[PDB]
Design an enzyme around this catalytic site. Structure first.
Site, PDB file in Angstrom:
ATOM      1  N   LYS A   1      -1.332  -3.680  -9.686  1.00 47.38           N
ATOM      2  CA  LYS A   1      -0.905  -3.610  -8.296  1.00 47.38           C
ATOM      3  C   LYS A   1      -1.243  -4.917  -7.570  1.00 47.38           C
ATOM      4  O   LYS A   1      -2.393  -5.365  -7.592  1.00 47.38           O
ATOM      5  CB  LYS A   1      -1.609  -2.433  -7.632  1.00 47.38           C
TER       6      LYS A   1
ATOM      7  N   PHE B   1       6.135   0.602   2.054  1.00 52.72           N
ATOM      8  CA  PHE B   1       5.326   1.433   2.928  1.00 52.72           C
ATOM      9  C   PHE B   1       6.225   2.029   4.005  1.00 52.72           C
ATOM     10  O   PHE B   1       6.894   1.297   4.738  1.00 52.72           O
ATOM     11  CB  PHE B   1       4.178   0.616   3.534  1.00 52.72           C
TER      12      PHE B   1
END
Lengths: 325, 323
Positions: B133, B180
């Site tokens: 990530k 997001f």
């Protein structure tokens, strides 16, 4: 009785006029002049300056092939037209800002600065009378670094909100920095002050102290003043660039202004030497940890970019008038 | 009595558990798992996972010379310890985050990712089960680009708030992106599910990927509530915190397909490019105030959680040295 303006000069600060309205500046007897995209846009709209815009439009028509090229060339010439006129009025230098749309392009910024300097030379202005004004991004600082050492082109580092930027600029041997006082205060205000507690004032003091302690030759020009209390707190600093309204307030007044900042005093406050100019990841990380500086730099670039796009449209309209008539 | 959770899966979305609390996740039968600094800090503070922190501290003490090196090595091992345990629970992958303090350092991010993969290999975990990530800065995207093509290391691009970042990520051939949803909405709120700017942004990205045939997986992340989730039902993956998973597990409220590649294709905007032009990417991203400010703050926040984990480990390292 001495005017507040003369008292500031006596306190050791060179006065710089922040305006494109060159007709209005001589009474303040400024040493240098600054312009930026907002000021150039404002001045370009004034009917009294129509002949300078016309000259720039004719120039752009000559050198561009596409309308886009014509317009972009004319915008360059507008900066130089106003700068050339300013240099007839001030004994020192004029700051002319590199296209803010290029703030993240070191190579394009160097080439634009070289081009502006060439246009000035063509107008009979030597590069010693010009400060090329560049946004204090990593790319802008590196561009200035090259221009100064490789080309002997003097730079004014603007949109400077942090000690981190100021350290990098000093190490890059830039001629002058323009730390913003008012915009720093704006951020922490939202999250007003006395002059002693003003975060913008404190930031500029930190930068000044550091430069003087470590013997950096870079000039400090406090910029973006919100009020005379900020100005009075920094009296003695190398230079201040001031809008016409604040110059008029200083001109008309006899209110006292005395030295607050000086090299011998400030040396003792300077923090320990640090370094950024040679470490891109470290600069970017530390700058990012400064929310205020990151957000204000980012926003300043967008704002000046919008002013350039507004100038583009103004020029487009005139260019069309020229073609048609 | 088909749960909302099951209907989400039936709608075509893979469910991913966003948690370090691996003992709590099996209930939801997630496909993959995600961890991040905040979650790793939280799970490390839990007493039931003390043995894994002890193992990591012992590991750091063995490999580091200075206390700083010991603590930093222990932090790496904590991530890998939790990831290793998660992979016994889930059938798919685990996302392990590269040190957010390296977000602006392409070279250090590549080296850190390689180190984490090596640590997993030492623990007996195959690299195809791991997603590295990485924050979606210019440097992070270029790091991912190298990891994917040079090293065959698969990346999950996080702190992704803009179409600009999403385009670059797709061109970099990254395995997965984590746009997001909630944080985008947060900015502009400071909305209906259809007018939610977070939802619209993710739909824009999804439609673009599907229209142009990019193989990069889209994992919607950072949900606030079920309204945003339901509007995005059908998207490739969603990573969800335990509270939302529990809500969905207990609920019977209907969830149907809303996003699919065949419908989305038609909404996709014209192809653009950023991966080969650093100045252009930086300028256009900077024009997106929301994305710039949220990426910037996200890096600060995750850096703060790492510093908090550092202090937790420092205290344990001292306890181990002393006792």
């Amino acid at each position: 009785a001495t005017s507040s303006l003369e008292q500031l000069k006596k306190a050791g600060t060179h006065v710089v006029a922040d305006s494109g309205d060159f007709e209005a500046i001589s009474k303040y007897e400024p040493q240098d002049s600054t312009t930026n995209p907002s000021l150039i846009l404002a001045a370009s709209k004034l009917e009294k300056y129509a002949r300078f815009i016309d000259a720039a439009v004719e120039y752009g028509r000559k050198h561009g092939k596409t309308d886009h090229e014509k317009i972009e060339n004319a915008m360059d010439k507008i900066l130089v037209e106003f700068g050339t006129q300013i240099l007839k009025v001030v004994p020192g230098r004029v700051s002319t800002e590199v296209d803010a749309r290029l703030s993240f392009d070191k190579k394009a910024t160097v080439k634009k600065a070289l081009h502006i300097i060439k246009l000035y030379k063509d107008a009979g202005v030597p590069k010693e009378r010009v400060l090329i004004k560049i946004a204090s991004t990593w790319e802008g600082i590196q561009a200035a670094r090259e221009l100064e050492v490789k080309h002997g082109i003097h730079c004014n580092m603007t949109l400077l909100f942090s000690f981190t930027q100021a350290v990098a600029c000093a190490e890059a041997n830039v001629t002058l920095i323009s730390p913003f006082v008012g915009r720093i205060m704006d951020f922490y205000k939202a999250l007003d002050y006395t002059a002693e507690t003003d975060p913008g004032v404190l930031s500029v003091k930190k930068i000044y102290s550091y430069y003087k302690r470590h013997g950096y030759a870079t000039e400090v020009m406090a910029a973006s003043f919100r009020n005379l209390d900020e100005l009075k707190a920094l009296a003695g600093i190398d230079n201040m660039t001031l809008p016409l309204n604040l110059l008029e307030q200083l001109y008309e007044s006899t209110d006292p202004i005395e030295n607050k900042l000086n090299s011998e005093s400030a040396k003792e406050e300077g923090v320990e030497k640090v370094s950024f100019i040679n470490d891109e990841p470290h600069f970017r990380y530390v700058l990012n940890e400064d929310q205020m500086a990151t957000e204000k730099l980012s926003d300043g670039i967008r704002k000046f970019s919008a002013d350039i796009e507004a100038l583009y449209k103004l020029v487009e309209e005139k260019m069309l008038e020229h073609h048609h008539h």
